[PDB]
Amino acid sequence: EKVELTLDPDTANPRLILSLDLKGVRLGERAQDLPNHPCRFDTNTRVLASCGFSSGRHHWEVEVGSKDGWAFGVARESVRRKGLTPFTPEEGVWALQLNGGQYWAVTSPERSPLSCGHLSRVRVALDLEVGAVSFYAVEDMRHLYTFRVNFQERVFPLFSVCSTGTYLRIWP
């Protein structure tokens, strides 16, 4: 069930910078001049993994920056790439987020504050049989949050970074 992911550069918003190893994402100062690939998020600061899941159970781990500005989890493949989307379950993203110095599950219309400790590394567990996306703090595999979803399509690991001082990294 453990998966080895890499970030898909064709999906990445042109302001993002992906590390050479395709495991890390940060936000650059300027938009790169990149082609208008159909998979590319052209406005929101997102990138997907190159691999998505249609069935079964899979998990991966994400190292998280201490500073505000990231969100990560999963997106349905049909998430709109072109134009400005809301970052919400209805628009096809199921994510945890750090901002305002607080961790959130990005529920809508109101986000859900989590009372977890400081997070360093998070396991994401996607179960398409059960219909759930779950997040655990790695150190004691402490459950943080589950979204229950009836996924009817391929689901991709999702990352977003909208501040220059933070990052996400597929671990290790």
**Residue (14 or 52) nearer to ligand Y3C, CB:** 14
106 vs 127 by CB, closer to ligand Y3C: 106
Task: Copy the structure tokens of residue 130.
Answer: 């059960």
Q: Six-digit token pair at 139?
A: 């150190």
Which one-letter amino acid corresponds to residue 48? L
Minimal distance, residue 95 CB to ligand Y3C, in Å: 7
| CB 23 to ligand Y3C: min, Å | 18
* Shortest CB 1 distance to ligand Y3C, Å: 26
Nearer to ligand Y3C, 97 or 134 (CB): 97
Q: Are 171 and 123 in contact (CB under 8 A)?
A: no
Distance (Å, whole) CA 70 – CA 16: 12
CA distances from 72 to 34, 36, 87, 96, 120 (A): 23, 23, 11, 6, 13
In the chain, the amino acid numbered 150 is N
Decide whether 45 or 134 has the Cβ nearer to ligand Y3C.
Answer: 45
Q: How far is the CB of 68 from ligand Y3C (least distance, A)?
A: 8
Q: Which of 13, 16, 23, 19 lies closest to 157, judged by CA?
A: 23
Applying CB under 6 A, the residues found at the interface with ligand Y3C are 15, 44-46, 69-71, 84, 87, 97, 99, 160-162
